[PDB]
Amino acid sequence: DIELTQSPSSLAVSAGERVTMNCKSSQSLLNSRTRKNQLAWYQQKPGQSPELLIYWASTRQSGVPDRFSGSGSGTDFTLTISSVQAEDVAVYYCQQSYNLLTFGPGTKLEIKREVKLQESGGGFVKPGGSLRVSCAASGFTFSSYAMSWVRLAPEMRLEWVATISSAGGYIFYSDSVQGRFTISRDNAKNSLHLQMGSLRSGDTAMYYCARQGFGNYGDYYAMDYWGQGTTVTVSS
Q: How far apart are CA 157 and CA 161, in angstroms?
């Protein structure tokens, strides 16, 4: 039951300055069996899905400019940008996978002046209703990756809700959706579904399917490809 805090919540700087953002974990994230700090960092610009910046506290994701680096171990972590740029405006979140899957509250950074996951099926419903968001996968071997649904509630916070394993043998839910939501996958047609029942206003969010990444040296404990996000609005 790990709580991550981030600081500062918000700051504005000028192009080219260095910034450091911190992430403090209420409990150590260094896993002694695996040798790794199960902590990742995401950048989310407005109107887009999160993008994986760093995992294992310090390993930069492929394709990320090297002005981004991650540091720290145990309970205190840091993301720094050496010479920030205009395209670096976004909210930055840290994310631990030591116990379940939980995100920090985010740091909003302002500047003072063929893998595809296409989603479908959001919309409006009233409390008690049901909806089914879905995720079509293309451009990679769907049946090798575990897949996850995480949402962005209006209040700026990301929240993991469900995970299904690569072959579909193992299924995990957040307590906040357990018994109401049902995740499923079909590895024959490369699709992922979230069947949502007994919807409540707290369920209103942008909903993202996302691929649990892994490499030749182990799972990232992070998600490297996200769909575009479909809105779910619980009514009245």
A: 12
